């Protein structure tokens, strides 16, 4: 009867086209502002002093870029970790010079993605679902907050944060290799196993369902039209695909349970990306990966090279060349 | 010893944020009755509007 | 300096295959409206 109850009834209605919910009250204003500023800053945005040395790095399309090289540049080294909104900038020209829109996009992104995650919970509550799709979405939220939030914190500047682009991503990955040795760190190892394993069990499960489909169509029409939507009959012989994989490797390595099978597809990647995103986090605070340089010596004591020493000389090439003007002192403490 | 404390209590403090997500998803749904799954006799989606 | 044959590569790489996929959808809906026999078959 009241105005608030007629508003709570609408905002929590599943009869809307897109469910809004109470998290959409701060998902939609956040992500539309992260979007509408991203499209403008990617297309039309002046160059940005990223190294704090007043050498402005172009990143937008109107200043001679493309899809690959164009990128929303991170904020300045001069700012660093300080909060830099528009009203604390004394003009928009001073805001866009010092890496303004990187903080406006990222902070409205991480609020909107952490609200998109809670929105996946909310609709599962109002639909009668068991709730935990949003726990599986915690794994890219852990990884998005690792390279945009946690790594600028432990390194003390948003300038070490990830550039919102495509070539800026590979500037981020290579400089992160030289300074932290991520490939030898066992948490990037535990998530390469998460996505190689994840793409394995995806294409391994998706093939054994498509292999054991039941005849419901003719050879002229499509294979997919043998599934009517909302039917109650099972659309594939699960005993058939169990007997196949029960002979392809051996018998006891096969899940006859389809529920425990469809749980292992959700376990393996998500655990692999939780562990990986806490690799960037523990390497944000300079707890680097393994270092086996000069580890094998002869009885005389001369250093015998290994593959890690060849990997070290690739890291030394990126270390002596990243931010080639920003350094003045012999050790990259930042 | 700073890098051991900032990388281990930080390490745990994300997984306990995941513990807030697991244990409250179950507890809010155990209070409502559907933590064991959807009822076959009464599905809530079928008693809704057309989908659009 | 960019290659001026790339405009012809991209804008025909967009339009010619994308206008192809539109045609397979329009004749799909015409056959469904063709059999249905009401107000649109003719």
């Amino acid at each position: 009867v009241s105005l608030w109850e007629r508003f709570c009834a609408w905002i929590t209605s599943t009869e809307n086209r897109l469910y809004i919910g109470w998290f959409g009250c701060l998902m939609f204003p956040t992500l539309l502002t992260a979007t509408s500023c991203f499209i403008i800053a990617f297309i039309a945005a002046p160059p940005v002093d990223i190294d704090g040395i007043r050498e402005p790095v172009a990143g937008s399309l109107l200043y001679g870029n493309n899809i690959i090289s164009g990128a929303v540049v991170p904020s300045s080294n001069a700012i660093g970790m300080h909060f830099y909104p528009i009203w604390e900038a004394a003009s928009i020209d001073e805001w866009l010079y010092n890496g303004g829109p990187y903080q406006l996009i990222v902070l409205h992104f991480l609020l909107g993605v952490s609200a998109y995650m809670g929105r996946e919970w909310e609709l599962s509550y109002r639909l009668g679902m068991r709730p935990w799709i949003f726990v599986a979405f915690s794994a890219p939220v852990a990884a998005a907050s690792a390279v945009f939030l946690v790594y600028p914190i432990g390194q003390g500047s948003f300038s070490d944060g990830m550039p919102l682009g495509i070539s800026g991503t590979f500037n981020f990955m290579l400089v992160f290799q030289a300074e932290h040795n991520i490939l030898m760190h066992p948490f990037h190892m535990a998530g390469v196993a998460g996505v190689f394993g994840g793409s394995l069990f995806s294409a391994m499960h998706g093939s054994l369902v498509t292999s054991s489909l039941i005849r419901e169509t003719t050879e002229n029409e499509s294979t997919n039209y043998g599934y009517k939507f909302g039917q109650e009959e099972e659309t594939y012989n699960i005993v058939a695909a169990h007997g196949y994989f029960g002979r392809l490797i051996f018998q006891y390595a096969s899940f006859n349970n389809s529920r425990a099978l469809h749980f292992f597809l959700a376990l393996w990647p998500v655990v692999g990306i939780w562990i990986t995103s806490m690799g960037i986090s523990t390497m944000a605070f300079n707890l680097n990966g393994f270092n086996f340089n000069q580890s094998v010596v002869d009885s005389q004591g001369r250093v015998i090279n290994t593959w890690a020493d060849i990997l070290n000389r690739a890291n030394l090439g990126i270390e002596v060349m990243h931010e080639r003007n920003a350094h003045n002192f012999p050790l990259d403490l930042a | 010893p700073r890098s051991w404390l900032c990388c281990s209590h930080f390490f745990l403090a994300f997984f306990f944020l995941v513990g807030h997500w697991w244990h409250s998803g179950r507890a809010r749904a155990a209070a409502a009755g559907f933590e064991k799954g959807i009822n076959r006799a009464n599905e809530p989606v079928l008693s809704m509007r057309p989908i659009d | 300096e960019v290659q001026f044959g790339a405009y012809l590569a991209v804008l025909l790489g967009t339009f010619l295959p994308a206008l192809f996929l539109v045609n397979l959808f329009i004749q799909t809906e015409a056959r469904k409206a063709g059999k249905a026999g009401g107000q649109d078959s003719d």
Partner: peptide, 30 residues
């Protein structure tokens, strides 16, 4: 002149995302 093509590809991609969400073929039981 060159960046005009890149912008048209980007907003043209966001058009077909808009039509796929709102003008989707709504699936129906029976």
């Amino acid at each position: 002149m060159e960046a005009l093509v890149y912008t048209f590809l980007l907003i043209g991609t966001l058009m077909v995302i808009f039509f796929a969400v709102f003008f989707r073929e709504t699936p129906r039981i029976l």
